[PDB]
Amino acid sequence: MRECISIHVGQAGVQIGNACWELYCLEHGIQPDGQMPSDKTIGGGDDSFNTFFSETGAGKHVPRAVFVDLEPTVIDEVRTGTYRQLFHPEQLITGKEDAANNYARGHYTIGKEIIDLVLDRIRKLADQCTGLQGFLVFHSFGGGTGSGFTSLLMERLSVDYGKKSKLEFSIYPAPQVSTAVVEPYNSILTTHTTLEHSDCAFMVDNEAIYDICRRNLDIERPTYTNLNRLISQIVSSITASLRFDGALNVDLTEFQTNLVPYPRIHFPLATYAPVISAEKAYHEQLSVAEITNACFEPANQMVKCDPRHGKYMACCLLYRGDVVPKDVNAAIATIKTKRSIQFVDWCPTGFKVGINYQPPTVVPGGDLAKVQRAVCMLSNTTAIAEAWARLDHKFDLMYAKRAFVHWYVGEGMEEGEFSEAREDMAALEKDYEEVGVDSV
Amino acid sequence: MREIVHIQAGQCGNQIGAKFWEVISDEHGIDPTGSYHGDSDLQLERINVYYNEATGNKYVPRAILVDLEPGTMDSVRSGPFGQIFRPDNFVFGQSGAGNNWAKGHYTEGAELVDSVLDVVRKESESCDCLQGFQLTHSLGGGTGSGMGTLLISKIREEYPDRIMNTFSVMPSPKVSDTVVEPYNATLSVHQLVENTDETYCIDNEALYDICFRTLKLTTPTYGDLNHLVSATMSGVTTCLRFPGQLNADLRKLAVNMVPFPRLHFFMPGFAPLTSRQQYRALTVPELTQQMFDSKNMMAACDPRHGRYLTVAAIFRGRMSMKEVDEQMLNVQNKNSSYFVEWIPNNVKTAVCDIPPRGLKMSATFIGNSTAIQELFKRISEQFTAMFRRKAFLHWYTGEGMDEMEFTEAESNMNDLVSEYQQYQDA
Numbered sequence A: 001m002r003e004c005i006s007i008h009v010g011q012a013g014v015q016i017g018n019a020c021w022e023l024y025c026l027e028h029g030i031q032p033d034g035q036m037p038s039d040k041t042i043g044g045g046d047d048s049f050n051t052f053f054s055e056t057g058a059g060k061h062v063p064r065a066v067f068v069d070l071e072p073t074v075i076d077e078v079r080t081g082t083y084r085q086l087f088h089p090e091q092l093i094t095g096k097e098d099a100a101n102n103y104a105r106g107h108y109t110i111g112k113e114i115i116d117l118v119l120d121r122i123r124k125l126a127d128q129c130t131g132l133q134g135f136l137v138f139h140s141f142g143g144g145t146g147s148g149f150t151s152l153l154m155e156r157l158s159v160d161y162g163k164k165s166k167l168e169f170s171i172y173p174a175p176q177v178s179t180a181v182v183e184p185y186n187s188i189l190t191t192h193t194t195l196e197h198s199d200c201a202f203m204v205d206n207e208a209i210y211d212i213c214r215r216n217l218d219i220e221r222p223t224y225t226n227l228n229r230l231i232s233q234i235v236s237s238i239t240a241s242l243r244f245d246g247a248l249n250v251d252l253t254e255f256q257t258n259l260v261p262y263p264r265i266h267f268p269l270a271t272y273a274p275v276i277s278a279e280k281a282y283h284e285q286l287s288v289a290e291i292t293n294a295c296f297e298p299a300n301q302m303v304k305c306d307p308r309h310g311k312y313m314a315c316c317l318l319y320r321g322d323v324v325p326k327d328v329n330a331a332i333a334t335i336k337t338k339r340s341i342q343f344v345d346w347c348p349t350g351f352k353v354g355i356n357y358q359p360p361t362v363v364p365g366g367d368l369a370k371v372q373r374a375v376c377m378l379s380n381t382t383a384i385a386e387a388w389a390r391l392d393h394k395f396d397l398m399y400a401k402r403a404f405v406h407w408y409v410g411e412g413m414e415e416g417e418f419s420e421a422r423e424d425m426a427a428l429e430k431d432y433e434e435v436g437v438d439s440v
Numbered sequence B: 001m002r003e004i005v006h007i008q009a010g011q012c013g014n015q016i017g018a019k020f021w022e023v024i025s026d027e028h029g030i031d032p033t034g035s036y037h038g039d040s041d042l043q044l045e046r047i048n049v050y051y052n053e054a055t056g057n058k059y060v061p062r063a064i065l066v067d068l069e070p071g072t073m074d075s076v077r078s079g080p081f082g083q084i085f086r087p088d089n090f091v092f093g094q095s096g097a098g099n100n101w102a103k104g105h106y107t108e109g110a111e112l113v114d115s116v117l118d119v120v121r122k123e124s125e126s127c128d129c130l131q132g133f134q135l136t137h138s139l140g141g142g143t144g145s146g147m148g149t150l151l152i153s154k155i156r157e158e159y160p161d162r163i164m165n166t167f168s169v170m171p172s173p174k175v176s177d178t179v180v181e182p183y184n185a186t187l188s189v190h191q192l193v194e195n196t197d198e199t200y201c202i203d204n205e206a207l208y209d210i211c212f213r214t215l216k217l218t219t220p221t222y223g224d225l226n227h228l229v230s231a232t233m234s235g236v237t238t239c240l241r242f243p244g245q246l247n248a249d250l251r252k253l254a255v256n257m258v259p260f261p262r263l264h265f266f267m268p269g270f271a272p273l274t275s276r277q278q279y280r281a282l283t284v285p286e287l288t289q290q291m292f293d294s295k296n297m298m299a300a301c302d303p304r305h306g307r308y309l310t311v312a313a314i315f316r317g318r319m320s321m322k323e324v325d326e327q328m329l330n331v332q333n334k335n336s337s338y339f340v341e342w343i344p345n346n347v348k349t350a351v352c353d354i355p356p357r358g359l360k361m362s363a364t365f366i367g368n369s370t371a372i373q374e375l376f377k378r379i380s381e382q383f384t385a386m387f388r389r390k391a392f393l394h395w396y397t398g399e400g401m402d403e404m405e406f407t408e409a410e411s412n413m414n415d416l417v418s419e420y421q422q423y424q425d426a
């Protein structure tokens, strides 16, 4: 019951997938060969970690996950690497030719050749669930597969699973690690196409994560490995309620109720603390008060934007590790009397709190200090629309001259799809303005 | 034998209900295995009101446990007195109700409700003379609120001549799980206005404030709130469970307490409320004054902000009935303005010799006060603050509801508020 199926799409989705599943295994005591000594029920169970892992009769704990990419070289490293025994070969799906940074190739030309196979593989995972709750879809905005194939997949999932929940972790592009000039096109196209098919989407701004690694972990020039380990800690905080039990544990769906006031307004801002090196953490315990305060520091947000210049529609605090309500309540009280936290007038101002008692874990050879306690704040703020504004403006600059548009038209698309997508984004930006205006 | 059938629904409903059965089982001398080990015949005289007798002189709660997910009832079954319940009386689904009245009332709850009614019928069928039903639930979630009120409607259809009694936990922003609680509570209150005879209104903020301010609990838990509620429920049902003259059954209670059919929402109270001086002897005068103290009441409504239509007071323990009568007469004679003058002798007092475990004496207060309108006004305000912007409505329209049903629920509760106001000025 309550199974969740993860789908990792394109290079960013897959490599972030690598980092998350490695981290989950460490959190649950699952070895790279899938064996889990502590699990006394062989070949099945309804434990909390079974939401993310199925079990074979031979005692293997297998991720409820599909990895998909239109070229093979990223997934080949999964097939041949440390956790290769973890996955059944059929869970790892590849084509020969990628989408060349072109949404149109991901959604149409190349994607259509593999979409039926991908859905068949997902169906095989679904059939093994007794109470499937929904999907978690990991992908970049900027890549041709991450944008175009993800959109196609989400559309097809709506048809095949109806209104079964679909959540995204979406990688928003940054110039420091971007690989295509057309990523703003791809971002607007996939955001428009997927908008009606996603229930909730956690955007991860690569520039925000890049900055955090440079500033808080003292990494000179962060690699995807650096970025992905941090992102997996944040993803793990968000899914921990699904994978662990506990008296004070609050289900993600319950936070979701508060986080989505209207279908289109479904983009929470995640903030995570503490991000600190081993050298800085040594002999320096960060209390509940300190990590809570850090959530209202914009430098620690997963998306660059300024909530102090917007309005809140929800604030959720997801704690893990050595944390009790007494300390949380005191920390929140201090914050309410010192911070730029303004809510819209049609929303209650209470902070919603969840506590998972299983302490944070780290991967060997990582940059993050092992800490006793951590917190992920999920807020619904009008400020996140800043991210759309920046992207929409880059789109406008290029599209006014129709730069690179021939690449998309050549693969069968029409200018009509571009302006339709961009108008949807304009409406979204306007939606975020409107929800912030006071009631009459 | 006037049997009562007990139903507990959803997370709040089952956690409080489990505590309730723990508390009254101890009072009746029933251990966790259903065996009787008391030393007083008073314990068994009306035991059949709440318990069935099984083979081997076992007593089994006439209780049905209902939820749309298995978690809380798993905990109940694993709890202290979990094995005392009839295994077949656990009725549950797997998908949950997501804090959504529509899921409880129209979609998920609809799929489960017939199986619940089958167990309700089985229990009713063996009753020599069924009084009616008591339901424990919250109004702020999905299962207790939505499926609980669906249940009440179907029970009324099948048992239209039986009394329906609820213990209903009202949500508060201060002790809140989700922002949609005012939607769920407003939808449910209209159901309760039409389909219950008596509803005890328990405000979670009142419970929290009693724990923090009076009991000096620095960080109250749901567990703490639930022990308050359980103690209160034990007190208010004392007249049903032990030999007595006043309000000895559900119908006679309703006839005494409900002068107008819609105004059947009660403010309960309990004394003593003591912080951990806890050994100090309590006097009847002190019991009486605390029982009527707003701080000892559980609807977060100021009694002095309205008037009492009717009041029932129950005293427990060995004490002077002469002094009880004197003290009760004193309260009415010294604050007579807060009792409506057009219902003569509207304060009834009962005394029961058996006090709650670990106390020499205690007192429970049940008030039908027009000040309860403050509770519904609060809910109505919170409702409108969101509804004016149609915020969070998609959770409900996605289950097939339309906005018109929210508009009608809103109007209905504002009508109720107006109806209280007219008798407060009468």
Ligand SMILES: C=C/C=C\[C@H](C)[C@H](OC(N)=O)[C@@H](C)[C@H](O)[C@@H](C)C/C(C)=C\[C@H](C)[C@@H](O)[C@@H](C)/C=C\[C@@H](O)C[C@@H]1OC(=O)[C@H](C)[C@@H](O)[C@H]1C
Pocket (backbone or CB within 6 Å): B023, B211, B215, B223, B224, B225, B227, B228, B230, B231, B272, B273, B274, B275, B276, B278, B279, B356, B357, B358, B359
């Ligand atoms: C927090 C106060 C606890 C105990 C007090 C000293 C008092 O106890 C005595 N003996 O006088 C009691 C009556 C308090 O005034 C009550 C408010 C306590 C209350 C009902 C709830 C608290 C919120 C909750 O934390 C709870 C776990 C704490 C103690 C309960 O075990 C007390 C017993 O509970 C009962 O059901 C009977 C009435 C009786 O046996 C009572 C002695």
Ligand SMILES: Nc1nc2c(ncn2[C@@H]2O[C@H](COP(=O)(O)OP(=O)(O)OP(=O)(O)O)[C@@H](O)[C@H]2O)c(=O)[nH]1
Pocket (backbone or CB within 6 Å): A009, A010, A011, A012, A013, A015, A016, A069, A070, A071, A098, A099, A100, A101, A102, A140, A141, A142, A143, A144, A145, A146, A147, A171, A172, A173, A174, A177, A178, A179, A183, A206, A224, A225, A227, A228, A231
């Ligand atoms: N955080 C993170 N971002 C990545 C990673 N790999 C790629 N990206 C970002 O993703 C975008 C590029 O899309 P990719 O996922 O590489 O492209 P793809 O989905 O494989 O699509 P095609 O290769 O065009 O078929 C750029 O913004 C990159 O900076 C990664 O491992 N981690």
Ligand SMILES: Nc1nc2c(ncn2[C@@H]2O[C@H](COP(=O)(O)OP(=O)(O)O)[C@@H](O)[C@H]2O)c(=O)[nH]1
Pocket (backbone or CB within 6 Å): B009, B010, B011, B012, B013, B015, B016, B097, B098, B099, B100, B138, B139, B140, B141, B142, B143, B144, B145, B169, B170, B171, B172, B175, B176, B177, B181, B204, B207, B222, B223, B225, B226, B229
């Ligand atoms: N007093 C009390 N209130 C509770 C408890 N659990 C939940 N609540 C309240 O009940 C409402 C949530 O409904 P809940 O019963 O959890 O939802 P359901 O399981 O769908 O009926 C909110 O107002 C909570 O504050 C409890 O154990 N005790």
Ligand SMILES: [Ca+2]
Pocket (backbone or CB within 6 Å): A039, A040, A041, A042, A043, A044, A045, A047, A055
């Ligand atoms: Ca197992």
Ligand SMILES: [Ca+2]
Pocket (backbone or CB within 6 Å): B095, B108, B111
């Ligand atoms: Ca169903």
Ligand SMILES: [Mg+2]
Pocket (backbone or CB within 6 Å): A010, A011, A071, A098, A099, A143, A145
């Ligand atoms: Mg690629």
Ligand SMILES: [Mg+2]
Pocket (backbone or CB within 6 Å): B011, B012, B141, B177
């Ligand atoms: Mg709940």
